[PDB]
């Protein structure tokens, strides 16, 4: 585990991370897909064979030692807002699980669900949220990427909140 675990927000590409373990923000099927996927697919392909599986999971593929944690967040654009919630949340949960079992000390994490199959609604609160109920009994450092600006000071400001 980390000496004193934190959570930390960073705008630039997960696939120039510098944590021990990706989470791939995955397709149920393991395709290249587009957003963070295709980003975790150029850089990690060799971590695409047998990734697929279902929805509200989390299966481990290693690219050589370096641990590739397939995510599986619902499409917005498919589920109910009811149902959608509850395979966002277990999602992440399959994610802490993993971390876990994988005795890392530091992961790197986008927030599921708030891209393309977000449902073109703004998910920040609700993922992040998700994030936080999961993660929050692991001992590894965690790194939340994201892409916007505002909604990297939106990210920042929940992490001081809880400090
Ligand atoms: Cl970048
Ligand atoms: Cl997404
Ligand atoms: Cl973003």
């Not at 590409?13 to 944590?19: L, Q, S, V, Y």
């Given at each position: 585990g980390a000496m004193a675990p934190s959570y930390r927000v960073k705008r630039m590409?997960?696939?120039?991370?510098?944590?021990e373990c990706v989470v791939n923000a995955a397709n149920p099927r393991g395709l290249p897909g587009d957003g963070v996927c295709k980003a975790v697919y150029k850089k990690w392909?060799?971590?695409?064979?047998?990734?697929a599986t279902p929805v509200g999971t989390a299966k481990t593929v290693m690219c050589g030692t370096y641990p590739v944690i397939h995510a599986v967040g619902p499409n917005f654009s498919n589920y109910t807002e009811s149902e959608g919630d509850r395979e966002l949340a277990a999602a992440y949960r399959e994610v802490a699980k993993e971390v876990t079992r994988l005795g890392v000390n530091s992961v790197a994490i986008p927030l599921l669900?708030?891209?393309?199959?977000?449902?073109?609604?703004?998910r920040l609160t609700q993922s992040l949220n998700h994030l936080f109920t999961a993660m929050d009994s692991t001992d590894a450092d965690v790194v939340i990427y994201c892409r916007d600006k505002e909604w990297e000071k939106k990210i920042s400001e929940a992490i001081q909140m809880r400090t």
């Open positions: 590409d997960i696939a120039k991370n510098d944590e392909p060799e971590s695409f064979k047998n990734s669900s708030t891209g393309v199959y977000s449902g073109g609604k703004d």
